[PDB]
């Protein structure tokens, strides 16, 4: 009959066992415990013990217990799976009763929800002062856009230097806690008024020189904070991606007099190239020996534990998480750049308008390749989100300024039907199963979307 | 690099861009080692069968494993080296028992194996399953014959190549 | 001792399956003291 | 024909049941095996807590999430 080979884990030891694939768990659990205790005692490891009243049980590694009355088969234990053996502590006790309504309300809420706390309060204050200083900096930028006054730049500079010194003092003095994210929030908040202060010093009417100067200095600061801090690096990766593209556009509008369409098509080309290059670049950026403040998952692994030994697993884990964060930041930045360039291209009142819609569709498919290919949940979701936002941005870019019921009805119809198809591909399709051949053919089609961009990039450039 | 672990054997390891380890084994053996690319937790990069000889008939498995594809497994274990050492001891103990015996190489003997593989050219073959025992037959002072297994999808797909002299 | 003659709620029974009983019996059979 | 324990390790055919520590109420699987050697001696020391912890938060996209993403 069938047998499942599985590696069970119990008392910090994993042992591979071959199990009767369709005996009920209630049959096998006891001699499995005896075998595990024999193996542990042979290893000199302290054996398993029944800590008071309770029961011996087996769980999936995700934590859920197996049905003891059921066999491995009907609960989908397959070969190569893993199981966690436990003595579950007894659950049952007196079911207490508070008869008075008011006291029962108070005790249930207090027991079950979390109050406000000064740890949270400081973070809230940091968030609100971050929002305030971005509003102030964006407001001064709006005024310098509207008016030629030199005086906003001293205000932006002084608020930037005050918040940056405050952030630095908090990061230096209060580094002892994971609430140093207060300092990180303030520093992220205060690099922006510095950028608009440097940008507003460019004389004459506002435009490309101000833009290239501000984005260049903000990207430079975002690059420095990697080497000096190395904390919360996904958002700075997205920001330095956006500033790199904006600075390339500003130098293209100053050194040359290129049109906007040429530059947007250049930016799209750079985007799809970078999407192809992003995982490799991330694995490069994984090892830049920047400072080693661990992140949340790494901290909460390190609390449970004390090229060989601990330092190797620690380096591997930190390296992997830095890779994941860089990759996620990159993909978010590219997603923003991709939607902003596609929105900038698809003016409805242009004679070439049919072409960038093709560019949109090709990019949409190409992004969906990566979405199905990349492993991290929030990266697949990033790719899917930006792909949708392409369609939404170009649709609104048409229908807002093109005052016709025709384009309106077309946009709103695709805007409701297309995500419903995107849902349908997983909602009705059984567990999103398709054949490997069909999958590879879909990968061929969305790859065959890419090489049409190259001549279209030439044709929209000229 | 080298380790002796809480297991049973001493295991040599090399690293350059990822970890490398090799097992010697001593007519035809079973081909089904493709399953051991996908152990209970670790995911290995490739299983390469390696063989060399004229006389001097030697046969080897060299295994590639990326830690960064395996971090979820390594994080549970006291070392990345201990992880791959255990997984190779698993393969060695799985092969061992029949007429052919198996053990992990010491890294010194890994450099010995590299020397014997060098000892100082035809096409890679598209269809290979029948070829192996006759592809040894062309006259040479030294032949190196090897087969590669890689996880293209949930299956495992095969390539083989050879050189002479 | 009975306090009053009227039948009333007493308990919800700790019912146990044949498999659990058999499992406990395979445990208890291990001992001879 | 040869008797294996629940994990699959066989019993020694030249030893009694007491000498192999088999007591009353024990379950033995009766099997026909092509060979007398089928053990897998390799133990791994793995920390069970992080092993059972980290799996749920390094998982890839599960279609039950993807449905929610689509619905959003």
XYZ file of C-alpha atoms in Angstrom:
732
model
C 0.000 0.000 0.000
C 0.966 3.670 -0.060
C 3.486 5.040 2.419
C 4.451 8.661 3.030
C 8.055 9.482 3.834
C 7.991 12.627 5.990
C 10.489 14.303 8.295
C 8.873 14.902 11.673
C 10.355 17.380 14.125
C 10.221 17.098 17.907
C 12.356 18.577 20.726
C 14.784 20.478 18.461
C 15.527 17.358 16.377
C 14.147 16.494 12.929
C 13.873 12.793 12.040
C 12.808 11.392 8.675
C 10.223 8.618 9.074
C 8.260 6.421 6.674
C 4.610 6.313 7.726
C 1.579 4.243 6.757
C -0.104 6.733 4.419
C -3.650 5.754 5.425
C -3.531 4.487 8.987
C -5.329 7.036 11.214
C -3.030 9.269 13.269
C -4.536 7.859 16.498
C -3.016 4.498 15.543
C 0.541 5.671 14.863
C 1.055 8.581 17.309
C 1.994 6.449 20.355
C 4.748 4.244 18.807
C 6.007 7.293 16.935
C 6.489 8.921 20.336
C 8.258 5.800 21.596
C 10.595 5.768 18.577
C 11.318 9.492 18.958
C 12.063 9.053 22.670
C 14.373 6.131 21.883
C 16.207 8.199 19.262
C 16.518 11.205 21.591
C 17.790 9.031 24.434
C 20.291 7.473 22.032
C 21.453 10.990 21.121
C 21.873 12.015 24.754
C 19.081 14.558 24.266
C 16.424 14.832 26.980
C 13.300 12.950 25.805
C 9.765 14.263 25.457
C 7.629 14.551 28.584
C 3.901 14.911 29.265
C 3.672 18.239 31.120
C 0.588 17.570 33.254
C -2.827 16.866 31.801
C -2.859 17.195 28.045
C -2.441 15.099 24.950
C 0.224 14.174 22.425
C -0.591 15.563 18.993
C 0.913 16.151 15.574
C 0.736 19.428 13.700
C 1.618 20.714 10.297
C 4.580 23.077 10.417
C 2.170 25.980 9.924
C 0.772 24.974 13.318
C -2.610 23.351 12.714
C -3.163 19.955 14.383
C -3.931 16.880 12.344
C -7.278 15.089 12.739
C -6.477 12.091 14.983
C -9.560 10.167 13.807
C -8.377 10.628 10.210
C -5.548 9.192 8.166
C -2.763 11.132 6.460
C -4.399 10.608 3.043
C -7.744 12.374 3.503
C -6.073 15.285 5.320
C -3.589 15.767 2.447
C -0.393 14.690 4.185
C 1.775 13.845 1.170
C 5.278 12.469 0.812
C 7.970 15.037 1.553
C 5.755 16.973 3.961
C 6.851 17.767 7.512
C 5.035 17.432 10.831
C 5.514 18.969 14.273
C 4.987 16.665 17.259
C 3.618 18.289 20.422
C 2.119 17.630 23.799
C -0.826 20.028 23.723
C -1.616 21.517 27.117
C -5.189 20.918 28.303
C -7.566 23.725 27.298
C -10.538 23.121 29.609
C -11.261 25.167 32.737
C -14.195 26.835 34.474
C -16.062 29.198 32.163
C -16.152 32.339 34.298
C -19.154 34.661 34.470
C -19.419 38.366 35.273
C -23.101 38.974 35.907
C -23.131 42.780 35.872
C -23.189 44.143 32.324
C -20.869 47.117 32.903
C -18.106 45.133 34.598
C -18.332 42.398 31.973
C -17.947 44.982 29.195
C -14.963 46.611 30.872
C -13.146 43.380 31.656
C -13.766 41.854 28.215
C -12.518 44.903 26.333
C -9.520 45.347 28.633
C -8.639 41.681 28.295
C -9.059 41.483 24.538
C -7.893 44.810 23.028
C -4.801 46.965 23.391
C -4.820 50.429 24.975
C -2.910 53.449 23.805
C 0.643 53.463 25.173
C 3.494 56.016 25.118
C 5.481 53.728 22.816
C 2.675 54.136 20.303
C 2.207 57.797 21.185
C 5.733 58.811 20.213
C 5.352 57.053 16.862
C 2.055 58.848 16.283
C 3.685 62.186 17.022
C 6.520 61.388 14.627
C 4.055 60.414 11.914
C 2.044 63.580 12.331
C 5.081 65.851 12.294
C 6.289 64.001 9.198
C 2.959 64.686 7.485
C 3.161 68.305 8.597
C 6.640 68.904 7.273
C 5.854 67.283 3.918
C 2.821 69.565 3.665
C 5.001 72.564 4.476
C 7.700 71.625 1.969
C 5.177 70.842 -0.778
C 3.444 74.113 0.020
C 6.652 76.121 -0.313
C 7.278 74.294 -3.574
C 3.816 75.318 -4.742
C 4.500 78.937 -3.832
C 7.848 78.969 -5.625
C 6.085 77.372 -8.597
C 3.496 80.145 -8.516
C 5.684 83.063 -7.449
C 9.274 84.081 -8.102
C 10.077 84.869 -4.464
C 13.545 83.906 -3.276
C 12.402 84.026 0.353
C 10.786 80.507 0.562
C 14.190 78.821 0.225
C 15.512 80.072 3.625
C 12.339 78.780 5.321
C 12.690 75.378 3.677
C 16.384 75.254 4.582
C 15.846 76.192 8.223
C 13.019 73.717 8.803
C 15.085 71.011 7.103
C 18.143 71.634 9.246
C 16.089 71.725 12.459
C 14.301 68.451 11.791
C 17.497 66.795 10.552
C 19.456 67.736 13.667
C 16.545 66.557 15.820
C 16.462 63.248 13.942
C 20.212 62.838 14.307
C 20.099 63.530 18.045
C 17.266 61.038 18.505
C 19.090 58.409 16.460
C 22.298 58.912 18.414
C 20.896 59.174 21.939
C 17.921 56.817 21.670
C 19.349 54.087 19.457
C 18.731 51.533 22.236
C 15.194 50.584 21.139
C 13.392 49.514 17.956
C 11.534 52.803 18.438
C 14.436 54.440 16.611
C 12.012 54.309 13.701
C 10.869 57.637 15.148
C 14.225 58.989 14.058
C 13.955 57.184 10.746
C 10.541 58.764 10.114
C 11.904 62.206 10.960
C 14.903 61.758 8.668
C 12.716 60.571 5.778
C 10.496 63.544 6.499
C 13.299 66.070 6.645
C 15.223 65.162 3.534
C 12.316 66.570 1.481
C 12.477 70.222 2.710
C 16.228 70.104 2.118
C 15.554 69.000 -1.450
C 13.061 71.777 -2.076
C 15.370 74.304 -0.398
C 18.231 73.424 -2.731
C 15.840 73.331 -5.694
C 14.343 76.752 -4.951
C 17.778 78.400 -5.115
C 17.753 77.940 -8.892
C 16.953 81.410 -10.281
C 14.509 82.355 -12.991
C 11.209 80.609 -13.644
C 10.720 77.177 -12.160
C 11.192 74.172 -14.413
C 13.674 71.496 -15.388
C 16.774 73.020 -13.634
C 14.920 73.181 -10.321
C 13.601 69.655 -10.886
C 16.962 68.108 -11.736
C 18.671 69.871 -8.828
C 16.067 68.882 -6.236
C 15.734 65.278 -7.364
C 19.504 64.916 -7.647
C 20.180 66.164 -4.137
C 17.313 64.120 -2.678
C 18.562 60.961 -4.382
C 22.098 61.685 -3.195
C 20.897 62.018 0.400
C 18.861 58.829 0.016
C 22.001 57.092 -1.185
C 24.062 58.361 1.760
C 21.530 57.214 4.354
C 22.166 53.651 3.141
C 25.805 53.751 4.121
C 25.334 55.769 7.287
C 22.205 54.044 8.647
C 21.150 51.040 6.590
C 17.655 51.093 8.103
C 14.283 51.037 6.318
C 15.947 50.717 2.962
C 13.065 49.702 0.700
C 11.510 53.158 0.751
C 14.879 54.798 0.120
C 15.490 52.344 -2.721
C 12.223 53.376 -4.361
C 13.079 57.031 -3.782
C 16.559 56.741 -5.267
C 15.063 54.929 -8.268
C 12.611 57.783 -8.816
C 15.319 60.402 -8.339
C 17.657 58.630 -10.757
C 14.991 58.705 -13.460
C 14.002 62.305 -12.708
C 17.630 63.458 -12.769
C 18.186 61.673 -16.092
C 15.180 63.545 -17.462
C 16.376 66.873 -16.093
C 19.842 66.503 -17.599
C 18.188 65.497 -20.872
C 16.139 68.698 -20.810
C 19.141 70.888 -19.932
C 22.045 69.401 -21.912
C 19.654 68.712 -24.794
C 16.300 70.158 -25.836
C 14.575 66.799 -26.224
C 10.812 66.500 -26.345
C 8.817 65.009 -23.497
C 7.637 62.026 -25.556
C 11.208 61.000 -26.426
C 12.151 61.101 -22.752
C 9.090 59.185 -21.582
C 9.791 56.433 -24.109
C 13.417 56.389 -22.914
C 12.145 56.084 -19.340
C 9.813 53.212 -20.267
C 12.719 51.449 -21.984
C 14.909 51.933 -18.903
C 12.039 50.596 -16.775
C 11.517 47.358 -18.696
C 15.288 46.827 -18.856
C 15.543 47.415 -15.115
C 12.649 45.024 -14.453
C 14.689 42.438 -16.303
C 17.819 43.397 -14.306
C 16.222 44.065 -10.891
C 16.718 40.643 -9.154
C 20.392 40.450 -10.129
C 20.962 44.071 -9.080
C 19.233 43.257 -5.790
C 21.550 40.292 -5.192
C 24.454 42.661 -5.837
C 23.064 45.283 -3.420
C 22.565 42.414 -0.946
C 26.266 42.569 -0.050
C 27.363 46.202 0.408
C 28.429 45.735 4.108
C 26.211 48.586 5.292
C 25.398 48.681 9.051
C 23.614 45.731 10.530
C 20.503 46.867 12.384
C 18.247 43.819 11.989
C 14.697 44.014 10.707
C 11.502 42.599 12.197
C 11.661 38.993 10.994
C 15.374 38.815 11.730
C 14.831 40.264 15.212
C 12.055 37.818 15.947
C 14.179 34.926 14.755
C 17.130 36.174 16.827
C 15.026 36.292 19.976
C 14.250 32.569 19.671
C 17.885 31.485 19.197
C 21.285 32.218 20.756
C 30.749 30.437 7.317
C 30.273 28.068 10.248
C 27.937 28.272 13.227
C 25.625 31.096 14.381
C 27.450 33.914 12.600
C 26.933 32.163 9.254
C 23.156 31.711 9.622
C 22.972 35.284 10.945
C 24.845 36.699 7.947
C 22.762 34.570 5.546
C 19.476 35.725 7.084
C 20.418 39.412 7.170
C 21.722 39.193 3.601
C 18.507 37.559 2.386
C 16.278 40.114 4.083
C 18.313 43.013 2.700
C 17.938 41.443 -0.742
C 14.164 41.070 -0.346
C 13.781 44.665 0.841
C 15.938 46.122 -1.941
C 14.041 44.112 -4.547
C 10.663 45.237 -3.197
C 11.731 48.891 -3.130
C 13.059 48.648 -6.680
C 9.849 47.108 -8.007
C 7.727 49.795 -6.339
C 9.890 52.540 -7.844
C 9.742 50.994 -11.305
C 5.978 50.586 -10.964
C 5.570 54.295 -10.256
C 7.875 55.204 -13.145
C 6.035 52.873 -15.535
C 2.595 54.255 -14.745
C 3.801 57.868 -14.819
C 5.438 57.425 -18.243
C 2.443 55.594 -19.734
C 0.164 58.324 -18.368
C 2.416 60.983 -19.886
C 2.444 59.318 -23.299
C -1.263 58.605 -23.928
C -2.644 62.018 -24.736
C -5.984 61.383 -26.491
C -5.727 64.435 -28.761
C -2.685 63.240 -30.694
C -2.444 61.629 -34.125
C -0.153 58.799 -32.981
C -2.454 57.876 -30.083
C -3.040 54.248 -31.152
C 0.636 53.339 -30.672
C 1.216 53.967 -26.916
C -1.924 51.955 -26.130
C -0.056 49.040 -27.727
C 2.954 49.920 -25.573
C 0.611 49.822 -22.560
C -0.743 46.373 -23.467
C 2.743 44.935 -24.103
C 4.034 46.316 -20.792
C 0.898 45.044 -19.028
C 1.591 41.486 -20.178
C 5.324 41.776 -19.483
C 4.621 42.885 -15.913
C 2.196 39.981 -15.469
C 5.082 37.632 -16.393
C 7.080 38.896 -13.433
C 3.999 38.852 -11.201
C 3.526 35.157 -11.867
C 7.282 34.538 -11.652
C 8.399 36.401 -8.514
C 7.988 34.602 -5.212
C 7.343 37.329 -2.589
C 3.653 38.070 -2.030
C 4.168 41.805 -1.883
C 6.267 41.827 -5.038
C 3.737 39.879 -7.087
C 1.099 42.215 -5.637
C 3.319 45.194 -6.534
C 3.631 44.015 -10.142
C -0.099 43.311 -10.452
C -0.973 46.681 -8.895
C 1.265 48.687 -11.238
C -0.009 46.674 -14.225
C -3.601 47.608 -13.335
C -2.592 51.214 -12.674
C -1.197 51.469 -16.218
C -4.690 50.863 -17.570
C -6.397 53.143 -15.054
C -3.947 56.006 -15.673
C -4.164 55.901 -19.468
C -7.960 55.493 -19.318
C -8.406 58.588 -17.170
C -5.792 60.518 -19.222
C -8.094 59.983 -22.174
C -11.542 60.378 -20.694
C -10.918 63.416 -18.467
C -9.862 65.910 -21.156
C -11.456 64.163 -24.151
C -15.033 65.361 -23.656
C -16.921 62.611 -25.477
C -19.419 59.956 -24.337
C -17.662 57.476 -26.669
C -14.309 57.459 -24.867
C -16.164 57.687 -21.537
C -18.181 54.523 -22.191
C -15.099 52.711 -23.513
C -12.984 53.639 -20.505
C -15.572 52.889 -17.833
C -16.430 49.552 -19.484
C -12.845 48.338 -19.658
C -12.209 49.825 -16.188
C -14.824 47.535 -14.689
C -14.504 44.443 -16.905
C -10.701 44.103 -16.963
C -10.039 43.670 -13.192
C -12.999 41.278 -13.097
C -11.155 39.145 -15.653
C -8.005 39.540 -13.532
C -9.966 38.171 -10.572
C -11.599 35.454 -12.714
C -8.183 33.946 -13.569
C -7.915 32.774 -9.935
C -11.512 32.839 -8.642
C -13.069 30.359 -11.073
C -9.893 28.679 -12.425
C -9.275 25.747 -10.025
C -6.404 26.882 -7.770
C -5.042 28.741 -10.865
C -3.960 25.345 -12.258
C -2.973 25.236 -15.913
C -0.681 22.816 -17.696
C 3.067 23.615 -17.706
C 2.922 23.791 -21.513
C 0.051 26.314 -21.420
C 1.921 28.297 -18.746
C 5.086 28.339 -20.895
C 2.965 29.410 -23.902
C 1.535 32.316 -21.878
C 5.146 33.103 -20.927
C 5.997 33.033 -24.635
C 3.125 35.411 -25.470
C 4.015 37.944 -22.797
C 7.676 37.582 -23.813
C 6.639 38.206 -27.447
C 5.228 41.458 -26.100
C 8.786 42.683 -25.378
C 10.593 42.853 -28.734
C 7.836 45.031 -30.340
C 8.759 47.746 -27.798
C 12.305 48.151 -29.284
C 11.177 49.368 -32.766
C 8.240 51.254 -31.240
C 10.778 52.922 -28.947
C 12.734 53.904 -32.068
C 9.540 55.097 -33.806
C 8.285 57.232 -30.921
C 11.787 58.605 -30.443
C 11.598 59.395 -34.168
C 36.124 24.237 4.237
C 35.189 21.274 6.428
C 32.774 20.125 9.133
C 32.096 17.263 11.496
C 28.517 17.451 12.740
C 26.003 16.032 15.253
C 25.506 13.435 12.507
C 27.677 10.506 11.506
C 30.285 11.544 8.923
C 32.871 14.240 8.412
C 31.944 16.342 5.360
C 34.089 18.622 3.215
C 32.472 21.758 1.785
C 33.651 24.319 -0.762
C 32.139 27.754 -1.331
C 32.644 30.469 -3.945
C 29.188 31.733 -4.968
C 27.175 29.083 -3.207
C 28.106 25.759 -1.666
C 29.597 22.685 -3.325
C 29.969 19.158 -1.938
C 30.677 15.761 -3.475
C 30.045 12.089 -2.703
C 31.933 9.120 -4.170
C 30.103 5.903 -4.989
C 31.327 2.546 -6.250
C 26.804 -2.611 -12.659
C 24.372 0.209 -13.253
C 22.967 2.083 -10.229
C 19.467 3.494 -9.916
C 18.721 6.765 -11.723
C 16.049 7.959 -9.282
C 18.268 10.360 -7.263
C 16.282 13.223 -8.866
C 13.908 13.057 -5.880
C 16.765 13.959 -3.523
C 17.049 17.355 -5.204
C 13.818 18.094 -3.293
C 14.402 16.939 0.280
C 11.933 17.536 3.129
C 12.988 21.171 3.490
C 16.111 22.094 1.535
C 15.999 22.779 -2.203
C 19.256 21.942 -3.985
C 20.327 23.678 -7.187
C 21.463 20.644 -9.174
C 22.447 17.006 -8.933
C 25.378 16.198 -11.209
C 26.461 12.610 -11.760
C 30.195 12.694 -12.552
C 32.402 9.860 -13.796
C 35.978 9.589 -15.053
C 38.298 6.801 -16.150
C 39.993 5.029 -19.038
C 41.233 1.636 -15.909
C 40.817 4.223 -13.101
C 37.000 4.001 -13.263
C 35.738 6.635 -10.811
C 32.156 7.798 -10.290
C 30.924 10.836 -8.353
C 27.951 12.958 -7.366
C 28.647 16.692 -7.102
C 25.829 18.761 -5.591
C 25.105 22.490 -5.797
C 22.970 24.261 -3.176
C 22.250 27.991 -2.928
C 21.805 29.136 0.699
C 19.766 32.142 -0.444
C 17.126 29.877 -1.971
C 17.281 27.813 1.241
C 17.241 30.502 3.987
C 13.893 29.242 5.358
C 15.617 25.901 5.996
C 18.994 27.255 7.184
C 17.322 29.567 9.729
C 16.034 26.501 11.591
C 19.507 24.957 11.761
C 22.678 25.860 13.615
C 24.710 26.295 10.392
C 24.328 26.508 6.627
C 27.223 24.050 6.377
C 25.493 21.758 8.868
C 22.385 21.989 6.676
C 24.102 20.806 3.506
C 26.259 18.308 5.419
C 23.077 16.713 6.758
C 21.444 16.712 3.306
C 24.484 15.023 1.759
C 24.708 12.479 4.595
C 21.043 11.779 3.751
C 21.967 11.094 0.124
C 25.016 9.027 1.143
C 23.005 6.864 3.553
C 20.325 6.483 0.881
C 22.833 5.221 -1.695
C 24.763 3.120 0.843
C 23.634 -0.425 1.567
C 23.831 -2.125 -1.828
C 26.965 -3.351 -3.646
C 27.917 0.300 -4.113
C 28.978 2.198 -0.991
C 28.947 5.960 -0.533
C 30.544 8.576 1.708
C 31.076 12.344 1.659
C 34.501 13.448 0.470
C 36.977 15.241 2.676
C 37.837 18.612 1.095
C 41.420 17.392 0.610
C 40.016 14.482 -1.380
C 37.737 17.030 -3.099
C 40.868 18.734 -4.436
C 42.145 15.251 -5.321
C 38.907 14.633 -7.239
C 39.294 17.976 -9.045
C 42.846 16.988 -10.012
C 41.719 13.594 -11.297
C 38.861 15.212 -13.239
C 41.373 17.506 -14.949
C 44.317 15.091 -15.487
C 46.112 17.958 -17.216
C 35.223 17.250 -26.653
C 32.150 16.353 -28.700
C 28.669 17.912 -28.747
C 26.313 17.923 -25.771
C 23.763 15.219 -26.489
C 20.046 15.911 -26.789
C 18.828 12.339 -26.181
C 21.026 10.547 -23.684
C 19.316 7.720 -21.752
C 20.697 4.862 -23.874
C 24.008 6.562 -24.655
C 25.990 6.334 -21.393
C 27.513 2.833 -21.579
C 28.508 3.222 -25.259
C 29.719 6.838 -24.960
C 32.551 5.444 -22.800
C 33.708 3.269 -25.725
C 35.650 5.752 -27.990
C 39.405 5.355 -27.601
C 41.056 7.870 -25.276
C 43.652 8.099 -22.537
C 41.060 9.846 -20.363
C 37.294 10.264 -20.533
C 35.110 12.421 -18.305
C 31.399 11.606 -18.455
C 28.750 13.536 -16.550
C 24.968 14.016 -16.351
C 23.112 17.064 -14.974
C 19.725 17.248 -13.218
C 17.990 20.588 -12.668
C 14.571 21.717 -11.300
C 13.085 23.269 -14.446
C 9.600 22.899 -12.941
C 8.168 20.582 -10.292
C 9.748 17.845 -12.401
C 13.454 17.338 -13.033
C 14.988 17.645 -16.502
C 18.200 16.144 -17.759
C 21.272 17.147 -19.752
C 24.538 15.301 -20.357
C 27.932 16.162 -21.814
C 31.357 14.573 -22.191
C 34.924 15.381 -23.140
C 37.862 13.214 -24.190
C 41.530 13.924 -23.397
C -26.935 11.920 48.697
C -29.991 13.058 46.761
C -31.110 16.524 47.825
C -34.445 16.633 46.013
C -36.541 14.263 43.954
C -37.106 16.362 40.824
C -34.980 15.500 37.799
C -32.816 18.388 36.637
C -29.765 19.198 34.515
C -26.775 17.284 35.839
C -23.940 17.202 33.292
C -22.843 17.089 29.708
C -21.243 13.667 29.314
C -17.509 13.326 28.597
C -18.229 10.942 25.700
C -15.187 9.213 24.222
C -14.619 7.451 20.912
C -13.653 3.812 20.445
C -10.312 4.830 18.919
C -9.346 6.950 21.937
C -10.413 4.156 24.296
C -8.358 1.648 22.286
C -5.384 4.031 22.312
C -5.579 4.431 26.087
C -5.909 0.651 26.371
C -2.727 0.193 24.328
C -1.089 2.598 26.765
C -2.409 0.872 29.904
C -1.431 -2.592 28.593
C 2.212 -1.437 28.769
C 2.151 -1.508 32.586
C 2.095 -4.336 35.106
C 2.762 -2.759 38.536
C 8.465 -11.182 5.471
C 9.845 -8.956 8.185
C 8.479 -6.757 10.964
C 9.120 -3.012 11.002
C 8.178 -0.385 13.568
C 5.935 2.594 12.808
C 8.824 4.633 11.377
C 9.874 1.727 9.147
C 12.979 0.471 10.942
C 12.968 -3.350 10.902
C 13.329 -5.660 13.857
C 16.395 -7.851 14.207
C 15.324 -11.377 13.148
C 17.844 -13.060 15.481
C 16.597 -11.338 18.643
C 13.543 -11.899 20.805
C 10.832 -9.303 21.357
C 12.047 -8.475 24.867
C 15.660 -8.009 23.743
C 14.459 -5.447 21.182
C 12.222 -3.673 23.760
C 8.800 -4.649 22.440
C 6.124 -4.695 25.132
C 2.405 -5.362 25.348
C 0.180 -3.126 23.268
C 2.941 -2.321 20.783
C 2.061 -2.066 17.107
C 4.245 -3.861 14.565
C 3.810 -3.503 10.816
C 4.111 -6.720 8.813
C 5.648 -6.034 5.418
C 7.414 -7.786 2.567
C 10.583 -5.841 1.780
C 12.976 -6.341 -1.118
C 15.997 -5.846 1.163
C 17.011 -6.099 4.812
C 18.555 -2.589 4.900
C 16.168 0.377 4.818
C 17.208 2.646 7.717
C 17.786 6.401 7.362
C 20.087 7.226 10.275
C 20.538 10.943 9.522
C 19.224 13.123 12.364
C 19.067 16.897 11.997
C 19.314 19.209 14.982
C 16.880 21.950 13.887
C 15.285 24.527 16.167
C 11.600 23.557 15.994
C 10.213 26.933 17.123
C 11.715 29.029 14.323
C 11.157 26.145 11.882
C 7.421 26.124 12.588
C 7.359 29.919 12.828
C 9.163 31.188 9.739
C 7.294 28.986 7.253
C 4.030 30.908 7.504
C 5.600 34.315 6.780
C 8.001 33.313 3.990
C 5.199 31.662 2.033
C 4.561 32.561 -1.622
C 1.243 33.962 -2.830
C -1.603 31.585 -1.893
C -4.634 31.863 -4.242
C -6.895 32.606 -1.257
C -4.860 35.810 -0.927
C -4.903 36.356 -4.700
C -8.706 36.244 -4.736
C -8.759 38.981 -2.086
C -6.243 40.983 -4.143
C -8.439 40.670 -7.219
C -11.559 41.594 -5.255
C -9.803 44.691 -3.919
